Amino acid sequence: YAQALQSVPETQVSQLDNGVRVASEQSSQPTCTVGVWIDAGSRYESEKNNGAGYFLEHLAFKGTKNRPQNALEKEVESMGAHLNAYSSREHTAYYIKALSKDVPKAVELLADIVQNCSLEDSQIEKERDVIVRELQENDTSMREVVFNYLHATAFQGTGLAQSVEGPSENIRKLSRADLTEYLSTHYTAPRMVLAAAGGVEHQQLLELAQKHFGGVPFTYDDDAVPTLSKCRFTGSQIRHREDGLPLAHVAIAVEGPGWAHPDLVALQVANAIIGHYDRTYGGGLHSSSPLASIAVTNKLCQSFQTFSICYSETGLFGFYFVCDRMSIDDMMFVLQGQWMRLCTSISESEVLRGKNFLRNALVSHLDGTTPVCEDIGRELLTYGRRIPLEEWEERLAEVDARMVREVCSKYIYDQCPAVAGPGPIEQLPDYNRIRSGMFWLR
Amino acid sequence: RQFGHLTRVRHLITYSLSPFEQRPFPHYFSKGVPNVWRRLRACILRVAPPFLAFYLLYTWGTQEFEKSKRKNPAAYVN
Secondary structure (H helix, E strand, O other): OHHHHHOOOOOEEEEOOOOOEEEEEEOOOOOEEEEEEEOOOOOOOOOOOOOHHHHHHHHHOOEEOOOEHHHHHHHHHOOOOEEEEEEOOOOEEEEEEEOOOOHHHHHHHHHHHHHHEOOOHHHHHHHHHHHHHHHHHHHOOHHHHHHHHHHHHHOOOOHHHOOOOOOHHHHHHOOHHHHHHHHHHHOOHHHEEEEEEEOOOHHHHHHHHHHHOOOOOOOHHHHOOOOOOOOOOOOEEEEEEEOOOOOEEEEEEEEEOOOOOHHHOHHHHHHHHHOEEEOOOOOOOOOOOHHHHHHHHOOOOOEEEEEEEEOOOOEEEEEEEEEOOOOHHHHHHHHHHHHHHHHHOOOHHHHHHHHHHHHHHHHHOOOOHHHHHHHHHHHHHHHOOOOOHHHHHHHHHOOOHHHHHHHHHHHOOOOOOEEEEEEOOOOOOOHHHHHOOOOOOO | OOOOOOOOOEEEEEEEEOOOOOOOOOOHHHHHHHHHHHHHHHHHHHHHHHHHHHHHHHHHHHHHHOOOOOOOOOOOOO
């Protein structure tokens, strides 16, 4: 095992005279996946700019000036390659998966997109109504509105509070211009990363990129990367009620440290302890995760998930459960009790497993090419370089009990949480109560 | 009656902040004191009256009783 890790090939990295960082992991696999990952999200938008990046995503594929829609689509389909992508609050990306016999072709396709989207005044107007619709579909997914609302209130009044898709007004009116304005402002080499994994050999990649990414920086701005305005967390709640729904959704959380910070490992290990449930499990005997056990014994919920979603300089460490109108309270009671237990009286027997369960994730985090690429893409972009499983190992292979406590309690104990809840939530006690559910009557 | 079966509510979104992210006795002047007055001058004219009235009657009563004791300079001018 340790050897298996030790024998895992290093991930080549190198920046251009441009600013783009080109990294990759050579394997053998006849297939592979390459793509660019941008240092851009909704976080970077304005009150009037917000949604661009997304409006933009829906056009990124519909063709370039160098080769219109009918073609781009035809050329990719024709080579059996897959082009897909996404955009969060601080992180966007476009990736392709082909037979590593096409690094050069893929690489070119990529560039041609992150640099020359047609932005056909005629296509735009179409996607405009496609989103407004797609948006009204994202809506009934109470599992997502809830998180949005969480962020909303959690980081109320700041860039983070804005949802990645954006208001209908913005989408109804963004101009062919604004989109261009968003592209030419954030899609710059210094903030972008060209990553890959497969049978591809670094050099052929570099050159190929160094060839199609012919960007040139004049001034110093171009060459530099602007740091964002800090986001203020706020212990608060938001309740979107409607007994009209089948069941309720709840999400509570404290502020997170941020990528850079190490503790995100100990903290990542703690969540592995409370883990997650889901009525399709087979386990009233689930190892620890009493929250799950209890959830089963007393029928506390349909499911729940522990999460340490983080950003550049902040984040959200919390949990979210889906439950029936009548078991909302106990569930919250029992869970919120686990955080305390977590940081007030944890045990080695627990952390031991915690670790293992993580390591197994940590590894399956890299199952395939597309996913690996995702790490290189991210890692660089958010951490600075790449963290080898061999490393993550140690980092989280030396977390003892006392370590979990010290930290969890450092981030959870007597902190003013941020809760959000849509659906039939009459039974969810007031803030004050969930608040004083943040300190154990030790 | 307990929690979870009080009423069929739908479409109300509320927003509130932790007690520690805000002020306890805020804006004593901006909005505080005004409303206190917005109130004294809203009922004074409804409560005061019968009380004031009572008072007058209390006084009249005590004064009269205290007069019917003293002698009339003329119950005997002989």
